[PDB]
């Protein structure tokens, strides 16, 4: 719900602002908003990916050799008030993806 | 709408396409009032969505030839290609350059 | 107070009355308690309770929530005469699953928690769009009748009414499942609007009281007929019948002879005031042995909800039409609206149903807000709006504060 | 290390990144990654073709 | 791009093959070593006292202490004809690199300790943690090993903490002591007669005598030096709840508890229990039971006999 | 347990049968209003007023 | 018009399965020949009628 308000707000602000300082014609402002939205539908899955914090892997840029078996990554523990017994469920790097999606 | 598998995300795309047609039709009756417009609008406004209900119920249980499935794909591209050249004409850009 | 008697529920449904120690902690009793129910089941010749793999035996409320193993039975809010359930809860421990490549990981995970579109839902969307389409078609055709008396409105709407009803009949007969019934019902209900304006538009000359008699009449008839042969969607059809009936009485009176609208509006208001007390009785008379009782219970519940909705709509329309910021004792209808609202505001507590109680409570608030808006639009000046704004925000704030504080 | 800052980059790495992005963008909308046919690019080139066609008419008008 | 897309898909099918083998290991390990809270309901089932010393039972002498990491039953082969580091394609390289790091271990499996492999196990931590773990160990053994195969002795000054032990049959005789001098007179006269510790194995289990002895030390008496400097005796194993210097001087026998309940120790091979490294590291997340839970389980077990 | 048996003591000694799966469900499927719900409705009304 | 259909798909996006459970044979009866007998897979019987 909050994302909807930001888009209609930001896009309308630019139309209103140009109308104020340059008195441009209604046909120019309405048609330009249409063209901006046609491209916006193509960028939506890419904008959505970065807003959510999904991170693509960084490349090693050829200054090190590949190591097949470094000591495995340490598992993480979790706690709950009612289910007072602590539990473990996985590495931090993997455990977060289930929330980002 | 085909590219979105989630329930509400795909419905909002199809819904946006239909509401434009309905809204433009009504606008033509409450202005430019006359028997043709009010009659034609009343026909489009009821036949257009009905045609969709039939296709929505009938398509999932039939088999179609690959030459036809490959053709509906190309309808989308043929719909995008004309938008920019038409918008700049509606905005009157070409005349403004030719009579610079 | 040293012990409490309670009913314990066991496997497949036997209830056993037992006198439990009121102060020992609950974890101390579940094991011997299980032995006793099994002993009685074994003597009764029924199959005893048994464990399955990995899990534990737990004592829970009828809602399923287990009691804290370390607390005393008196420490928890359990009283003599209550009932509990003894249950087995299985072990949920299993290995954790990991996926490295974010592309495949997001795809797999996201497909589990959210539901994709399917051919079953696809039909209900189309069915809803066709219903929306025709209610728009009747709107423009009706708007045309308001400026022209020609037969076009009745002529064109009549054919639509026939077509929509025709299609609905095939769907109703071909139906097989609950999903098929939903689609059929939405389609039939959409036929009521075109048919209704089709009749009302037929009488020549300018629109008004004479046409009104036909409209609200055919509307009431169609809704009743649909309810009789369909026997489903009781609440909504019931509401249409009530609002249609009362409007037909007013239309007929105004058409035949009426000294003033105030007279008719006052008459309707009094009819509604007495109708609220009759509503539960009306609902009650409108309604293997278990099937008859539950069918009777849900059928009865539905009728009252619809009946209350119909009355609520009429009073606010009548009440807001009776009050006036310029006519005579401007304060008389204002205070009268207050006294009328108080009854509804207080009586809402007499009914157990959530939606029934909420609709009653909501009916009073809307009238007060509506009256202030009327007195703000007309007699417009800074004093009027300044007073109405303050009133409208303080009004509900005090109501919630008195209940929560 | 860790790729911080604005270091230079090879053309092999540019397409490499751009491929992982297309595959992930598809996962958000189609929930699968088999990608027997890649509609993401096909739909994008149709926009690029429309923008290019519009600019060509402007050069024609400007030349006139 | 077509080669990249094909390579990624080939890895996903390997993942699916790996995942199925891991599920079979999860199913099997749970079937032999359940969580301590679930043991009570199983008392009536034939799973109780199931463990046998007759060579074919590979689980004899094994006790569950918690959960942690372990190596899957899969065997990965190295890639052939590897391209030089200056020639690797950047997408498939990282994909194959990350694959090796995470797919080499499986999370949340039950970690275990073997009695037949060490003279003692020093437990170092606060009293509340140590007693929690020790009670769990006793009931884990008690459910899985029969009284004809395991006998248990406690040497403690805080007798008020061991009051619940009364119900268990493994503590019976034809048995808690206040000091080493007392234990030396009654019990050590029998056990000190012969031997010293000797690490065994499953096949060897057929030769060791039936009654295995477990001793719990909770007194911190300096008199223990006699048996410790002699390197114990065979058929006995000690658990130190105090953390005394004579027991605490061997890393290969020391378990350290973190404030979070995480235990650290030296890594041991899953197949031979042999120590594979010299530095202590993460080992298992601790599981613990209350005094009430211990007596509750003990009462349920006290109802049965051979 | 050790208990005091007063002369007035009487025990039911009777059992009744009903499917446990339905009784538990009917406990929440429909019942009277709760204060938390009343608060949510109150919040919505003042929000509507402003 | 006769309803013959030609299936073409990328093997369901999967490899072949030679051991898939064969289709259940259909049972048939006749008014006079009231004793039922099974003739074969439903998919194959339609072809003999479609032709």
Residue numbers in the entry:
A (entry chain DB): 253 to 353
B (entry chain DB): 404 to 503
C (entry chain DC): 18 to 304, 344 to 461
D (entry chain B1): 10 to 73
E (entry chain C3): 101 to 274, 285 to 416
F (entry chain DB): 102 to 151
G (entry chain D1): 303 to 353
What did the published study say regarding this structure?
Specialized protein transport systems—known as type VII secretion systems (T7SSs)—are central to the virulence of this pathogen, and are also crucial for nutrient and metabolite transport across the mycobacterial cell envelope. Mycobacterium tuberculosis encodes five homologous, but functionally distinct, T7SSs that are designated ESX-1 to ESX-5. Here we reconstituted the ESX-5 T7SS of M. tuberculosis H37Rv in M. smegmatis to obtain a structural view of the entire T7SS membrane complex from this human pathogen.
Cryo-electron microscopy (cryo-EM) analysis of the M. tuberculosis ESX-5 complex purified in the presence of ADP–AlF3 showed clear hexameric particles. We performed an ab initio reconstruction without symmetry enforcement that yielded an average resolution of approximately 4 Å, which improved to an overall resolution of approximately 3.5 Å after further data processing; this allowed us to build around 78% of the stable complex de novo. In the intact ESX-5 complex, the angle between protomers at the membrane level differs by about 0.5°, from 59.7° between protomers of one dimer to 60.2° between protomers of adjacent dimers. However, at the cytosolic level these angles differ by more than 10° (from 65.3° to 54.7°). Beneath the EccB5–MycP5 chamber, dimers of the EccC5 ATPase assemble into three bundles of four transmembrane helices each, which together seal the potential central secretion channel. At the very centre of the complex, one TMH of each bundle contributes to the formation of a pyramidal assembly that aligns with the periplasmic chamber. Our work provides a fully assembled structure of the ESX-5 inner-membrane complex of M. tuberculosis.
